[PDB]
């Protein structure tokens, strides 16, 4: 199957130049189209036929395509350019399909980095009385708005029962997120402790609770 | 946009199923959509920015050593050794050629077909459908009408005349 | 002006079917393909297939060949996509888009998208549990909140102290759990010194089930 390969993340400061690569087998012989999708909005064409620009798209958007890599270049990046970007080609072969890249999230750093605050709530005794148990991990006041959460049960990782929200802006324009671990009341008392691990920009913050 | 009233300098109108364009006189190349000129056979220091093919010019490339190449003009790409619009880079038409559809803000490459063929909406608008195309060329020169030559409409001497057209 | 207008959000049970429409206007319907693109939450765009408005010809990605049927009505220039045997984990947004009928034309206009939520659940009010502050939930300030468990459908609204308390409050987006039920939490950062003197009551409102819950949150 024909594949388009994009990097998952690109981060730039306002005014800098961002480059988003789209790798493909002999992609230079194909017409590459680029689409911009802001969070919760409709995808929008920004570059088509390798380097043509629709009216309304600023000149600082430019595209190139050669060999095995097509590139979207955004000069003088602004906060409004923060969005996901997808490349797209038509596979002329017998498979006869349109192909989208994996998408690239462009982060535009509009404020200094901020490590998150982690607060881990144990299950309330009320919920235990209802024969359920939910651990609530509060992640607040971080920037940029991307984290990864891992749950540990007595020094061992936890797979099932985890739900995590996509980060969203707080009142102070910093990001917040939440992670829930669902247990049975027996599992809650069976282990000596449970831990919530939040990874943000390489450094991990950890919080632990125990039955009490 | 090329029309039936367009004068093709050093050239002449030709008609296909969906468009008109200028075709150059023998050994000439298009330097513009309405202008034909002589073409350089090899790009060198004395031929910079001079025509070397349809919609292509000679360019100098500073280097060690200095190199020269025939480069397509802006908006054109080299495809099967010919300069065609970049919107047509991936368009194969069969019994026709790809042209520019500019009826929308977003341009697209679409097919225009040899006489007798029309774009087949059931086959990616390729030239796989039989259909008639009436000639619209005004051939107002002496003893010449519209004739289908190698699948395209052009003005040509009437039956019994040869190149102005003489008997 | 070219417009692609899709039908509204849908809620369906696993194994059921749904038919989403894409009303088109402002251009010659028969000159452009209609494509459908699926997007699971937090995931990338995925091309599903196209329909040719002239003959109703369809071209599907292999992975959607078995449970997707694309049709069109030329008299009202509307395209349709029917999903069959919906999977319990198949909640996703579906976009329609057009491009010129030719090879490799870009998708110049898109519909606004249609959310299809798949859940076996029916209307159900939420359970509300307190997230009590304590010695471990205290820099020089403390966090407390309310856990709003297992409601259906969306939405719930949470206020604190009947709206009198706003600064520090953050209500999170809901999560759609494997059970097909939603859960969220609303949290508020407060001065630790005011604990035991200030009263914190979260007001949970679930209009679909006609349920209101007020939960006083006190220190452990």
Domain span holding position C84: 1-120
For the record, the structure tokens of A118 come out as: 């982690």
**Are both C160 and C192 inside the same structural domain?**
yes
**Are both C49 and C92 inside the same structural domain?**
yes
**Are both C33 and C66 inside the same structural domain?**
yes
CA angle A171, A174, A176 (to 5 degrees): 90
Distance, in Å, from the CA atom of C200 to the CA atom of C144, rounded to the nearest integer, reads: 9
Whether residues B86 and A92 touch (CB distance < 8 A) is answered with no
For the record, the structure tokens of B31 come out as: 């330097």
Distance, in Å, from the CA atom of C38 to the CA atom of C183, rounded to the nearest integer, reads: 25
**Are both C192 and C130 inside the same structural domain?**
yes
Q: Of C72, C92, C120, which marks where a domain is finished?
A: C120
Instruction: Name beta bridge partners: B116.
Output: B131
Return the closest-CA partner of residue C204 out of C214, C219, C196, C218: C214
**Are both C106 and C205 inside the same structural domain?**
no
**Residues B57/B49, Cβ–Cβ less than 8 Å:** yes
In chain C, residues with a C-beta closer than 8 Å to the C-beta of A136 are: 131, 145, 147, 185
Task: Provide the number of CB pairs (under 8 Å) joining chain A to chain B.
Answer: 28
Instruction: Please give the method by which this entry was determined.
Output: X-ray
Alpha carbon of A40 to those of A83, A111, A164: distances in Å?
A: 10, 22, 18
Whether residues A29 and B86 touch (CB distance < 8 A) is answered with no
Instruction: Name beta bridge partners: B147.
Output: B154
Homologous superfamily of B8-167: Plasmodium vivax P25 domain (2.90.20.10)
- Concatenating the DSSP letter of every residue in chain C gives --EEEE---EEE-TT--EEEEEEEESS-GGGEEEEEEEE-TT---EEEEEE-TTT--EEE-GGGTTTEEEEEEGGGTEEEEEE-S--TT--EEEEEEEEESSSS----EE---EEEEE-S---BPPEEEEE---STT---EEEEEEEEEEEBSS--EEEEGGGTB-TTEEEPPPEE-TTS-EEEEEEEEEEGGGBTTB--EEEEEEGGGTEEEEEE----
Whether residues B124 and C100 touch (CB distance < 8 A) is answered with no
Domain at C193, CATH number: 2.60.40.10
Mutate to test the interface with A, among B88, B101, B106 (most CBs of A within 10 A): B106
Rounded to a whole number, what is the distance in Å from the CA of A129 to chain C's nearest CA? 11
Return the closest-CA partner of residue C189 out of A142, A138, A143, A168: A138
In the Cβ-directed half-sphere of C103, how many Cα atoms lie within 13 Å?
23
Whether residues A138 and C143 touch (CB distance < 8 A) is answered with yes
**Are both C115 and C59 inside the same structural domain?**
yes
**Are both C193 and C219 inside the same structural domain?**
yes
Number of domains in chain C: 2
**Are both C212 and C105 inside the same structural domain?**
no
**Are both C70 and C14 inside the same structural domain?**
yes
Distance, in Å, from the CA atom of A1 to the CA atom of A24, rounded to the nearest integer, reads: 11
Whether residues B89 and A49 touch (CB distance < 8 A) is answered with yes
Distance, in Å, from the CA atom of C85 to the CA atom of C74, rounded to the nearest integer, reads: 27
At what resolution in Å was this solved?
Answer: 2.4
Could you give the domains of chain A? 1-110 (2.60.40.10), 111-212 (2.60.40.10)
**Are both C164 and C198 inside the same structural domain?**
yes
* Alpha helix (H) residue ranges in chain A: 125-129, 185-190
For chain A, list residues whose CB is within 8 angstroms of any CB belonging to chain B: 29-31, 45, 48-52, 54-55, 90, 92
Distance, in Å, from the CA atom of A82 to the CA atom of A145, rounded to the nearest integer, reads: 12
**Are both C115 and C127 inside the same structural domain?**
no
**Are both C1 and C103 inside the same structural domain?**
yes
């Amino acid at each position: 199957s024909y594949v388009l390969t994009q990097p998952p993340s690109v981060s730039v400061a306002p005014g800098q130049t961002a480059r988003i690569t789209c790798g493909g087998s002999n992609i230079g012989s194909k017409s590459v189209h680029w689409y911009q999708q802001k969070p919760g909005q409709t995808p929008m064409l920004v570059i088509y036929y390798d380097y043509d620009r629709p009216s309304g798209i600023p000149e600082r958007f430019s595209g190139s395509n050669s060999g095995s890599t097509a590139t979207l270049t955004i000069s003088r990046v602004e906060a409004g350019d923060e969005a996901d970007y997808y490349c797209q080609v038509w596979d002329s072969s017998s498979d006869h399909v349109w192909v989208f890249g994996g998408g690239t999230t462009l982060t535009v750093l509009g404020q200094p980095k901020a490590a998150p605050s982690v607060t881990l709530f144990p299950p309330s005794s009320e919920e235990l009385q209802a024969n359920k148990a939910t651990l609530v991990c509060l992640i607040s006041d971080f920037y940029p708005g991307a984290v990864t959460v891992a749950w540990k049960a007595d020094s061992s990782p936890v797979k099932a029962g985890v739900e995590t929200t996509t980060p969203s802006k707080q009142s102070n324009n910093k990001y917040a997120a939440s992670s829930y671990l669902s247990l049975t009341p027996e599992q809650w008392k069976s282990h000596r402790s449970y831990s919530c691990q939040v990874t943000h920009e390489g450094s991990t913050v950890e919080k632990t609770v125990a039955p009490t | 946009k090329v029309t039936v009233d367009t004068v093709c300098k050093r050239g002449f109108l030709i008609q296909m199923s969906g468009h008109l364009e200028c075709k150059c006189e023998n050994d000439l190349v298009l330097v513009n959509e309405e202008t034909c000129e002589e073409k350089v056979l090899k790009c060198d220091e004395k031929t910079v920015n001079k025509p070397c093919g349809d919609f292509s010019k000679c360019i100098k490339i500073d280097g060690n050593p200095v190199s020269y190449a025939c480069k397509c003009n802006l908006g054109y790409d080299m495809v099967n050794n010919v300069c065609i619009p970049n919107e047509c880079k991936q368009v194969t038409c069969g019994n026709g050629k790809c042209i520019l559809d500019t009826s929308n803000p977003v341009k697209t490459g679409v097919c225009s077909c040899n006489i007798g063929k029309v774009p087949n909406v059931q086959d990616q608008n390729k030239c796989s459908k039989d259909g008639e195309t009436k000639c619209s060329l005004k051939c107002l020169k002496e003893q010449e009408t519209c004739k289908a030559v190698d699948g395209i409409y052009k003005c040509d001497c009437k039956d019994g005349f040869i190149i102005i057209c003489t008997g | 002006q070219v417009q692609l207008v899709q039908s509204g959000a849908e809620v369906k049970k696993p194994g059921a079917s749904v038919k989403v429409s894409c009303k088109t206007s402002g251009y010659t319907f028969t000159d452009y393909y209609i494509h459908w693109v699926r997007q699971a939450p937090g995931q990338g765009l995925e091309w599903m297939g196209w329909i040719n408005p002239t003959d109703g010809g369809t071209n599907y990605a292999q992975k959607f060949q078995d449970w997707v049927t694309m049709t069109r009505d030329t008299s009202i220039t509307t395209a349709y996509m029917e999903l069959s045997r919906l999977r319990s984990d198949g909640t996703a947004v579906y976009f329609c888009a057009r491009d010129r009928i030719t090879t490799a034309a870009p998708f110049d206009y898109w519909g606004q998208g249609t959310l299809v939520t798949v859940s076996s659940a029916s209307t159900k009010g939420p359970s509300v549990f307190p997230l009590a502050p304590s010695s471990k939930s205290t820099g020089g300030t403390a966090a407390l909140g309310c856990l709003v468990k297992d409601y259906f459908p969306e939405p719930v609204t949470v206020s604190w102290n009947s709206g009198a308390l706003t600064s520090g409050v953050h209500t999170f987006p809901a999560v759609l759990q494997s059970s097909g039920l939603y859960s969220l939490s609303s949290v508020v950062t407060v001065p630790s010194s005011s604990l035991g003197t200030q009263t914190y009551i979260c007001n949970v409102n679930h209009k679909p089930s006609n349920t209101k819950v007020d939960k006083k949150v006190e220190p452990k």
